[PDB]
Amino acid sequence: EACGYSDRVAQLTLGNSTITTQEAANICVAYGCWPAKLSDTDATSVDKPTEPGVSADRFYTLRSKPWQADSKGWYWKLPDALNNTGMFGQNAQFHYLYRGGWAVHVQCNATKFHQGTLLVLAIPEHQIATQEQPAFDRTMPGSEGGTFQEPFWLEDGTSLGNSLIYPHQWINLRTNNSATLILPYVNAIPMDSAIRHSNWTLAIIPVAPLKYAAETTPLVPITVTIAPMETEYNGLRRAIASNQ
């Protein structure tokens, strides 16, 4: 009975970082779950955990990517993409175990003279595969992220069309400037190694290509800002940054 008014403006503040947006499409909370810390009954690792708080529970902005006419899509594995950035990365390296949620803010502004539609997805356990089994540079691309080679099949032999079953938002230029997803921790065990297992994959795929009221078109970037939430770490030792 109505679908757009005060839900367009938003401000998220975590630690020493705040994000604002004047053309949002509400906020999506994956599976209706808010990030939360591990229960005494669900837990198994006996050591008292490290809870970094503000030092790690804040927004990090990755290098922007340009949206081009031949662009197929981009993806980032979590925690992979952030494992080597800031205080979050340090904690992830120094500990054998990690658990945490995410606050994802994908942004892409254009003009009322453009048209284009991006599908923003948060895929749990996005195990990928193409005509061959992927190499480390594809499975854990770090902060630079990766690119879809077979976006129609979602790089896993399934389908882009049925991917709406995963938490998602759309950045349809005639409507919005960005997408915001809040993700809880997902795994079949209480905690896991940040360097050996990627829990979520942030995927951004152009479904309706970028067109403009001229043939040129200025550089239109896509920027990803991510914040770790309700984190805890166990198994302290030396820092180990990758599974190589």
């Binding site: 990928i128 005509q131 032999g157 399934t158 079949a188 990627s198």
Partner: protein, 268 residues
């Protein structure tokens, strides 16, 4: 335990002429599915809920036996085995593709059939032994091997020509649920493609077979698995491309399409 949950009903509707309430108008960008109900789009009559939903329940969906293994015992060795996965046959594997995590018990049923060299049925009566060989236990090398004493490993003995063998298994993973998919590596300090997407916690071992006396004819074991007492989490886009390998998700993907093509979008 009762399975009487019903589908929803329809109540009567009338004409709307409102300059405020507009349910037909949505905004899919939010990631939310449409809010419109039949009643708000057309003048509807009353329909009392009469349809059940039990056949689409997670339990009913998985609760039936499917072929998962089919080892062949040769006459020269009189012994085979089967790596315990549900990845060898496509039908069950594709059913599981709908979910990320699944916790359940299993009911195995084994049917044994003897054949000739030309694969025609023959009459053959012996007793076979199925032994569970968990990771770390020594594997049998011959029909003779001492490992068949089964001092600790559990075993099932049944006749080749007797009723099928059958038993249940609890939820065995070291994890809290099995994973149908795994975006990570099997080992630390290893980055080999053969170890990506492999979650060792799902592999409980092998099933070894032998006849209690050297086999006269072939003997093939068909292993059926019934998933029961199921719990599922995180639905996924199901598998559309065919499965090429047992331990990874690679697909052929020649023509990038799933449904059929047509001449015009304006005619059938």
């Amino acid at each position: 335990q009762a399975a009487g949950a019903l589908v929803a009903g329809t109540s009567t509707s009338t004409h709307s002429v409102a300059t405020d309430s507009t349910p037909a108008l949505q905004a899919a960008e939010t990631g939310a599915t449409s809010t419109a109900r039949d009643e708000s789009m057309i003048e509807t009559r009353t329909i009392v809920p009469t349809h059940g939903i039990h056949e689409t329940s997670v339990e009913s969906f998985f609760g039936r036996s499917s072929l998962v293994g089919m080892p062949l015992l040769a006459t020269g060795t009189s012994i085979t085995h089967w790596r315990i996965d549900f990845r060898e046959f496509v039908q069950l594997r594709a059913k599981m593709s709908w979910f990320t995590y699944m916790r359940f018990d299993v009911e195995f049923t084994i049917i044994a059939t003897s054949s000739t060299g030309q694969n025609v049925t023959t009459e053959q009566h012996t007793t076979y032994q199925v032994m569970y060989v968990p990771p770390g236990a020594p594997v049998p090398s011959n029909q003779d091997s001492f490992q068949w004493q089964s001092g600790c490993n559990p075993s099932v003995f049944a006749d080749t020509d007797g009723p099928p063998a059958q038993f249940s298994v609890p939820f065995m993973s070291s994890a809290n649920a099995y994973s149908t998919v795994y975006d990570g590596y099997a080992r630390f300090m290893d980055t080999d493609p053969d170890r990506y997407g492999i979650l060792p916690s799902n592999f409980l071992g092998f099933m070894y077979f032998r006849t209690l006396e050297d086999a006269a004819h072939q003997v093939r074991f068909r292993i059926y698995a019934k998933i029961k007492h199921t719990s599922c989490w995180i639905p996924r886009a199901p598998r559309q491309a065919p499965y090429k390998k047992r331990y990874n998700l690679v697909f052929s993907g020649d023509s990038d399409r799933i449904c059929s093509n047509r001449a015009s979008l304006t005619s059938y």
